[PDB]
């Protein structure tokens, strides 16, 4: 086809292992997550993939995944663009809580409702939240407007601030013929996949992208996929 696009979700984070809601908390890769990013890199290398430009979030689990991939494929020299707009979903008050704490405080019913809903957000991260200053006052978000910096996000909110970056900064590069690598997060990548395949809310909430595995799209000139997404590996 005309174009080729590659996506990868960051490998396992240290809070993926603790089973805690990271969201905008900047958790690093776990050692296993680093190995995942490395195997994804080796997969892209064995298949001879070349890129011209890379996009990622401002979160180090995604960034380190990109670094590990670029290292594996000997393309550390590529231009890299970072944006908060490819960040993980902001999980508001749930940030920092594990499964048990979440259920204990909100109940199994409320947790299932949040879990299965597309447009209902978790509660907001309030100023007394233990990660409030760590996230909301981080200087990497200093240039965001009052409206842009979320206290919480539904999957809808997430996709809503992710697709403008896709349309305005990524799409033109692709149509310029640049071969794009996007290393990011499950939910921000869900936005892109939903747009690409024209999926429904139910369908996208059913899609679970695996950590650290390359996802290949073959696109026509209008960025319509000519076939289903493909995973790279062994």
Ligand X SMILES: Cc1ccc(S(=O)(=O)Nc2cc3c(c(O)c2O)C(=O)c2ccccc2C3=O)cc1
Respond yes or no: is residue 10 known to be catalytic: yes
Q: What span, in angstroms and rounded, lies between the C-alpha atoms of 70 and 44? A: 10
Subset of residues 118 to 147 that bind ligand X, contact rule: CB under 6 A: 122
93 labelled ligand-binding:
no
Give the number of C-alpha atoms closer than 13 A to the C-alpha of residue 62, restricted to the C-beta side.
32
Residue 161: strand, helix, or coil: helix
60 binds a copy of itself, rule: CB under 8 A: yes
Q: Which of 36, 88, 153, 185 is catalytic?
A: 88
Residue 39: strand, helix, or coil: helix
Residues in the chain: 234
Q: How far is the CB of 178 from Cl ion (least distance, A)?
A: 17
Residue with tokens 């990271």: 22
- Applying CB under 6 A, which of residues 5, 6, 7, 20 lies at the interface with ligand X? 20
Q: Which of 10, 34, 129, 185 is catalytic?
A: 10
108 labelled ligand-binding:
no
Instruction: Dig out the tokens for 134 from the structure.
Output: 């760590």
Respond yes or no: is residue 88 known to be catalytic: yes
Angle made by CA atoms 184, 119, 124, in degrees to the nearest 5: 80
Q: Toward Cl ion, which CB reaches closer, 2 or 80? A: 80
Taking residue 214's Cβ as centre, other Cβ atoms within 10 Å add up to 22
Residues that bind a copy of itself (CB under 8 A): 26, 50, 58-60, 63-64, 67, 74, 76-82, 139-140
Residues that bind ligand X (CB under 6 A): 19-21, 98-99, 102, 111, 114-115, 122
Extract the annotated binding site for substrate: 9-16, 22-23, 61, 88-91, 99, 115-116, 186-187
């Amino acid at each position: 086809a005309a174009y080729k696009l590659v996506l990868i979700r960051h490998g396992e984070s240290a809070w993926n292992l603790e089973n805690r809601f990271s969201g905008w908390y900047d958790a690093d890769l776990s050692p296993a997550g680093h190995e995942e990013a490395k195997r994804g890199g080796q997969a892209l290398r064995d298949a001879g993939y070349e890129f011209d430009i890379c996009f990622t979030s401002v979160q180090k689990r995604a960034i380190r995944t990109l670094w590990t991939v670029l290292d594996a494929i000997d393309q550390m020299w590529l231009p890299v663009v970072r944006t908060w707009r490819l960040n993980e979903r902001h999980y508001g008050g749930l940030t920092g809580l594990n499964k048990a704490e979440t259920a204990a405080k909100h109940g199994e019913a409320q947790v299932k409702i949040w879990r299965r809903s597309y447009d209902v957000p978790p509660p907001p991260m309030e100023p007394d939240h233990p990660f409030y200053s760590n996230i909301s006052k981080d200087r990497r978000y200093a240039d965001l407007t009052e409206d842009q910096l979320p206290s919480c996000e539904s999957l809808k909110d997430t996709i809503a601030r992710a697709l403008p970056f896709w349309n305005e900064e990524i799409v033109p590069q692709i149509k310029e013929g640049k071969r794009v690598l996007i290393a990011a997060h499950g939910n921000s990548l869900r936005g892109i996949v939903k747009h690409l395949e024209g999926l429904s809310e139910e369908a996208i909430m059913e899609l679970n992208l695996p950590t650290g595995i390359p996802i290949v799209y073959e696109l026509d000139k209008n960025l319509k996929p000519i076939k289903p997404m493909q995973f790279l590996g062994d």
